[PDB]
Amino acid sequence: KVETHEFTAEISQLMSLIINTVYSNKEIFLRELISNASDALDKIRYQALSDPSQLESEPELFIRIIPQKDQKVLEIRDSGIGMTKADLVNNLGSGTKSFMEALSAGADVSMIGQFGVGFYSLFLVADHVQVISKHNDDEQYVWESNAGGKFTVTLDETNERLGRGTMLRLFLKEDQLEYLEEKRIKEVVKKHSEFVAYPIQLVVTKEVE
Numbered sequence: 001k002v003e004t005h006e007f008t009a010e011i012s013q014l015m016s017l018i019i020n021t022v023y024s025n026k027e028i029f030l031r032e033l034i035s036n037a038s039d040a041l042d043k044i045r046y047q048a049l050s051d052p053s054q055l056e057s058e059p060e061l062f063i064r065i066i067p068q069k070d071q072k073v074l075e076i077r078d079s080g081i082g083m084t085k086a087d088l089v090n091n092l093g094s095g096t097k098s099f100m101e102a103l104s105a106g107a108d109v110s111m112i113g114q115f116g117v118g119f120y121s122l123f124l125v126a127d128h129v130q131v132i133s134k135h136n137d138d139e140q141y142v143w144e145s146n147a148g149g150k151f152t153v154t155l156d157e158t159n160e161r162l163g164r165g166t167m168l169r170l171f172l173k174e175d176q177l178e179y180l181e182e183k184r185i186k187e188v189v190k191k192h193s194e195f196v197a198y199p200i201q202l203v204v205t206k207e208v209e
């Protein structure tokens with residue numbers, strides 16, 4: 001059963017801004033999303049210093065990028081802490097207002113991650129997103145959205161089990177399909193995410209002839 005919720009007004013306004021801006025360095029979306037993954041992996045790793053059974057839901061700590069060319073979808077999966085349904089309905093934090101203000105004063109989009117709202121840079125290159133997530137002691141959910149208006153949260157009894165962590169599915173814009181290319185992904189990872197302290201896997205798929 002689907003639950004529908006409205007974005008705060010400032011989030012809808014941020015989305016509309018990002019999805020329509022003409023920024024010439026849109027590749028930074030991948031850095032912002034890998035930084036969120038890294039942070040989520042740090043959080044589970046450090047909780048597990050007190051309580052190592054927290055890692056049992058998925059013993060590997062990794063980041064995994066899966067272009068799906070048939071679907072025009074770029075997936076980014078991590079085995080970090082994940083998000084509770086509460087994180088998914090009410091959000092985490094106000095970073096959103098503080099970043100539109102910042103843009104007003106000439107701030108660069110590349111600085112979105114200083115304000116904790118790096119997730120939304122994905123709308124530089126995508127017009128729809130699914131967030132699949134699984135937190136310890138809660139269920140697996142799909143959060144889904146176009147850019148502005150409503151988002152939905154749905155109990156996930158259909159998809160592959162994450163074990164623990166998060167998978168973003170970016171539905172790429174027709175002008176940004178280069179982020180399905182292996183060499184483009186590799187060089188953007190190496191340029192902006194060179195010092196991430198977790199392995200970054202990239203899946204290349206030979207599709208059936």
Ligand SMILES: CC[C@@H](C)Nc1cc(C(=O)N[C@H]2C[C@H]3CC[C@@H](C2)N3c2ccc(C(=O)C3CC3)cn2)c(C)cc1C(N)=O
Nearest residue numbers: 006007008011036037039040087088089090091092119166
């Ligand atoms: C603890 C996780 C953190 C370290 N990393 C991540 C953070 C995020 C992230 O930003 N999600 C938030 C919460 C959810 C899911 C996407 C988006 C932003 N949503 C919402 C939800 C609600 C609202 C609202 O208007 C409120 C109703 C009024 C706005 N936005 C993500 C997506 C992943 C990771 C990660 N890879 O693990």
